[PDB]
């Protein structure tokens, strides 16, 4: 079994960890936008089907 709720309250509010969460919840959204721009680049940089 893992850590207590009221034990976690002693650590989880430390500025180091709050800055860590702020950084990661920026980096995830940034990395998703990275894949989005990537996908759009693939869709531009690919040969379209010739018409019938």
């Amino acid at each position: 079994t893992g850590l207590s709720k009221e034990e976690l309250l002693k650590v989880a509010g430390s500025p180091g960890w709050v800055r860590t969460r702020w950084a990661l919840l920026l980096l995830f959204w940034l990395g998703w936008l990275g894949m989005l721009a990537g996908a759009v680049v693939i869709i531009v940089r690919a040969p379209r089907c010739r018409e019938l």
Binding site: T1, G2, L3, S4, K5, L8, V11, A12, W17, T20, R21, L24, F28, W29, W32, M35, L36, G38, A39, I42, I43, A46, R48, C49, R50, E51, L52
Partner: protein, 454 residues
């Protein structure tokens, strides 16, 4: 903290109707008609497999309100067959069944959503895999922020399917307004035709994996099944009737995506409508499959089967964040395997096997424990009819397609080793226990998550 019961009667319908329909109806009919061989008998198996689905789900409406617990088809066998039989299912559901199903349906989202930028040739593989994964990442985030957000998303993409199938039925009736042959009747063939609908209807059990999150399950769970699954049945027979107004047997039995060709036949200026609707259909199927899977891995950890990181909840937002992050990572790790459509077929039958073991367990409980309260009960003939129908259909797999089975069955047996080391052993080396605890508290500190209080 505790997970609040946010799923309404309507959201309970949108969880089920919004995940049954998915890709199935818009791509499967060719694979019914190949084994039916006739537009007469095809419209029979679409109704008959519907009837099998209603009686199955009606067994689950009982079973879920007898146990009254959120772990669905895992809980309902843990309460019966005990620790290791439930673990074998959970291991397979965690490692294979659910990551593969999410990933391929996310791929169906991508490949159909992009289709009008590539009308006559395959969409490029990198674009498909990126767009598939961007879907799984975005839906994971939506599920992490708010149960209210994810359930209000599930309405939108439940509606999207019913609107799309309404558009198919509308065009069908318009062609009837504007203006049984050939059947391969063999008793050893038509059972394989009935099997083809058990991709298309499959998913009616999903509402049981979220039982503890409905506002009043003793009403909502059986009522949402009875509202939903007959509506799906009606929609399917009308949708296939609509296809058979437009496409000949020779077109339908050869075509790649029957609904897209149907779309091209009528909607020449705006033919991309149906391709995009099959895409948006899938986006809601992934959401529901992801929401619902998160609860299984969470519940498994409460009952001692999985590491105690996954039982934790985020106090500020009241979502099982580690389970959703695990769901996502495990699904995205699945994306780069090659022969997926072999995998999900040779394990296709394992779902039906477990559904049968669950209703067998229900009758074994009605013998052993009349002590348990049962706010609704089904007449025992329906379970017995349903278990006959299930075990008959399991047997078909080993007649028509046994060849793959050893590759799947190896993974089932590979569940036993991990059970012993992970669950029965109780972590005797204190250095491994300290490593587990260290790993745990890092996740705790990082994600800001805490155990549930009952």
């Amino acid at each position: 903290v505790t997970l609040q019961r946010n799923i309404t009667l309507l959201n309970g319908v949108a969880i089920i109707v919004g995940t049954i329909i998915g890709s199935g109806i818009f791509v499967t009919p060719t694979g019914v008609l190949k084994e039916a061989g006739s537009p007469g008998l095809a419209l029979v198996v679409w109704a008959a497999c519907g009837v099998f689905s209603i009686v199955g789900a009606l067994c689950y409406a009982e079973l879920g309100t007898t146990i009254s617990k959120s772990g669905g088809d895992y809980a309902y066998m843990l309460e019966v067959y005990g620790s290791l039989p439930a673990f074998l299912k959970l291991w397979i559901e965690l490692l294979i069944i659910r990551p593969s199903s999410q990933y391929i349906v996310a791929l169906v989202f991508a490949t159909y959503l992009l289709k009008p930028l590539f009308p006559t040739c395959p969409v490029p593989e990198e674009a498909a895999k990126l767009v598939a994964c961007l879907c799984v990442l975005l839906l994971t985030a939506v599920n992490c922020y708010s149960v209210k957000a994810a359930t209000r998303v599930q309405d939108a993409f439940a509606a999207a399917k019913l609107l799309a199938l309404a558009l198919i039925i509308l065009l069908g009736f318009v062609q009837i307004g504007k203006g049984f042959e050939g059947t391969k009747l063999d008793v050893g063939n038509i059972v394989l035709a009935l099997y083809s609908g058990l991709f298309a209807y499959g998913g009616w059990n999903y509402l049981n994996f979220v039982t503890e999150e409905m506002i009043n399950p003793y009403r909502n769970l059986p009522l949402a099944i009875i509202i939903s699954l007959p509506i799906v049945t009606l929609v399917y027979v009308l949708t296939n009737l609509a296809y058979f107004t437009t496409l000949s047997t020779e077109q339908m039995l050869s075509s790649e995506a029957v609904a897209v060709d149907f779309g091209n036949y009528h909607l020449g200026v705006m033919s991309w409508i149906i391709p995009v609707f099959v895409g948006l259909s899938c986006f809601g199927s992934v959401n529901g499959s992801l929401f619902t899977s998160s609860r299984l891995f969470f519940v498994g950890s409460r009952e001692g089967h999985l590491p105690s990181i996954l039982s934790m909840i985020h106090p500020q937002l009241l979502t099982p964040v580690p389970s959703l992050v695990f769901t996502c990572v495990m699904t995205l790790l699945y994306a780069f395997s090659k022969d997926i459509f072999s995998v999900i077929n040779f394990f296709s039958f394992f779902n039906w096997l477990c559904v049968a073991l669950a209703i067998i367990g229900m009758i074994w409980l009605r013998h052993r424990k009349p002590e348990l309260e049962r706010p609704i009960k089904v007449n025992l003939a329906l379970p017995v009819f349903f278990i006959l129908a299930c075990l008959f259909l399991i047997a078909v797999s080993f007649w028509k397609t046994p060849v793959e089975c050893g590759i799947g069955f190896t993974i089932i047996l590979s569940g036993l080793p991990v059970y012993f080391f992970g669950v029965w052993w109780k972590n005797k080396p204190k250095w491994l226990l300290q490593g587990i605890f260290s790993t745990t508290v890092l996740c705790q500190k990082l994600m800001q998550v805490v155990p549930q209080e009952t």
